[PDB]
Design an enzyme around this catalytic site. Sequence first.
Site, PDB file in Angstrom:
ATOM      1  N   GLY A 152       1.213  -0.902  -0.120  1.00  0.00           N
ATOM      2  CA  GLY A 152      -0.353  -0.381   0.505  1.00  0.00           C
ATOM      3  C   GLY A 152       1.051   0.982  -0.013  1.00  0.00           C
ATOM      4  O   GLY A 152       1.878   1.150  -0.349  1.00  0.00           O
ATOM      5  N   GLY A 208      -1.088   5.213   2.373  1.00  0.00           N
ATOM      6  CA  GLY A 208      -0.075   5.214   2.870  1.00  0.00           C
ATOM      7  C   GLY A 208       1.335   4.080   2.862  1.00  0.00           C
ATOM      8  O   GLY A 208       0.970   3.497   2.021  1.00  0.00           O
ATOM      9  N   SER A 209       2.276   4.149   3.416  1.00  0.00           N
ATOM     10  CA  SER A 209       3.814   2.921   2.620  1.00  0.00           C
ATOM     11  C   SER A 209       3.559   1.815   3.581  1.00  0.00           C
ATOM     12  O   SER A 209       4.501   2.251   4.891  1.00  0.00           O
ATOM     13  CB  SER A 209       4.644   3.936   2.309  1.00  0.00           C
ATOM     14  OG  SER A 209       5.404   5.847   2.922  1.00  0.00           O
ATOM     15  N   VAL A 210       3.503   1.136   2.962  1.00  0.00           N
ATOM     16  CA  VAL A 210       3.216   0.066   3.892  1.00  0.00           C
ATOM     17  C   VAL A 210       4.043  -1.700   3.056  1.00  0.00           C
ATOM     18  O   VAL A 210       3.530  -1.376   2.087  1.00  0.00           O
ATOM     19  CB  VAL A 210       1.795  -0.755   4.171  1.00  0.00           C
ATOM     20  CG1 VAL A 210       1.539  -2.275   4.615  1.00  0.00           C
ATOM     21  CG2 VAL A 210       0.751  -0.149   5.468  1.00  0.00           C
ATOM     22  N   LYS A 248       4.924  -0.445   8.600  1.00  0.00           N
ATOM     23  CA  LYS A 248       4.057   1.107   7.864  1.00  0.00           C
ATOM     24  C   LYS A 248       5.682   1.190   8.387  1.00  0.00           C
ATOM     25  O   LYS A 248       6.114   1.937  10.028  1.00  0.00           O
ATOM     26  CB  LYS A 248       2.606   0.755   8.615  1.00  0.00           C
ATOM     27  CG  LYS A 248       2.600   2.179   8.184  1.00  0.00           C
ATOM     28  CD  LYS A 248       1.076   2.034   8.167  1.00  0.00           C
ATOM     29  CE  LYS A 248       0.469   3.499   7.161  1.00  0.00           C
ATOM     30  NZ  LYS A 248      -0.900   3.995   7.423  1.00  0.00           N
ATOM     31  N   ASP A 291      -8.018   1.030  11.729  1.00  0.00           N
ATOM     32  CA  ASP A 291      -8.425   2.420  11.173  1.00  0.00           C
ATOM     33  C   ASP A 291      -6.916   2.353  10.111  1.00  0.00           C
ATOM     34  O   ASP A 291      -5.805   2.548  10.509  1.00  0.00           O
ATOM     35  CB  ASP A 291      -7.957   3.707  11.884  1.00  0.00           C
ATOM     36  CG  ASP A 291      -8.809   4.504  11.414  1.00  0.00           C
ATOM     37  OD1 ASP A 291      -9.151   5.519  12.527  1.00  0.00           O
ATOM     38  OD2 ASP A 291      -8.885   5.302  10.190  1.00  0.00           O
TER      39      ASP A 291
END
Length: 332
Positions: A27, A28-30, A45, A160
């Site tokens: 994914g 934010g940066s995940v 994350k 969330d």
Amino acid sequence: RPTFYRQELNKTIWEVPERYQNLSPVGGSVCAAFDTKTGLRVAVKKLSRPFQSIIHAKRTYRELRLLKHMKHENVIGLLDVFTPARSLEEFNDVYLVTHLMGADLNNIVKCQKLTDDHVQFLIYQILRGLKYIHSADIIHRDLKPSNLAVNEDCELKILDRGLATRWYRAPEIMLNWMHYNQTVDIWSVGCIMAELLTGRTLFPGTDHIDQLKLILRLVGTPGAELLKKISSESARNYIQSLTQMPKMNFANVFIGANPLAVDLLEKMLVLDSDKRITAAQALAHAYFAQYHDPDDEPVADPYDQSFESRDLLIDEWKSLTYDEVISFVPPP
Ligand SMILES: Cn1nc(C(C)(C)C)cc1NC(=O)Nc1ccc(Cl)cc1
Ligand SMILES: CCCCCCCCO[C@@H]1O[C@H](CO)[C@@H](O)[C@H](O)[C@H]1O
């Protein structure tokens, strides 16, 4: 401190302990990683510019405090938190480690064929997790399918992401009531539940006003009892301003649904949030008979959130967050 290594992914640098291997963006940066200590796959994350503004710094701190606290099966918890920084002076980045779970509930919804038993187990787990969250005095306020991680065996964790989301929001949140009780999240469970039954979005509003038009179609315009609680001017003065809508009987909307599912929906989807069923009460509803266990629906340890009242400097929130990194103790 372990030894770190640097790697570039999608224009983002990542400095992580050697422990975390196989790194690949999600994914934010995940990223997905392989945790060589426990032999399991994790989501890592890296927080973007965590101490950039006051508000960023405070949210970074709330993030950590919140995840450090959540310790329940049906709520996201912290597997680890680390920073490459050797000191506060050098402290700038924060990485969080959590379980990866394959899908969110959004994927699972529109392509799979959900048994009543599926709806029982999925909805049971949301309530269970919400009892826990709510017992710490936390209101989620943005509960939706994208905020529910589901694994392959339909085990479910609330989270969330965070920053349509509006499809599951309580009417009071959407008129910006400012006095929100916890049942806002119960409203959200109602919308989700209805959608798992019918396979379609309950209130697929096109925009703010349409959303509310669709809510009232179902639940009816406010009754006398609710109306008498509205403090304000023309908040109430546009009463039947979208016709004096009669409440739909849900047995008519959810044709062929378990009548116990129907009855629970009627108790979740009340306009008046003082009349909404609580998470703990919904747990005891006959609809969850196959899953309800009174001795394994735990509540949270006292959560100190005085900090939310506080107006501090970027560097105080940064120090406070540093302390929280330092003081983290990993799960067993
Ligand atoms: C802000 N916040 N609030 C909650 C609840 C209300 C569920 C406790 C949970 C969270 N935070 C998150 O859910 N955060 C989060 C962190 C890492 C990943 Cl990969 C995904 C999500
Ligand atoms: C579309 C008309 C709006 C109806 C929304 C009213 C339901 C919200 O619930 C109301 O608001 C507060 C919670 O924030 C409660 O404390 C009030 O007592 C409750 O009746």
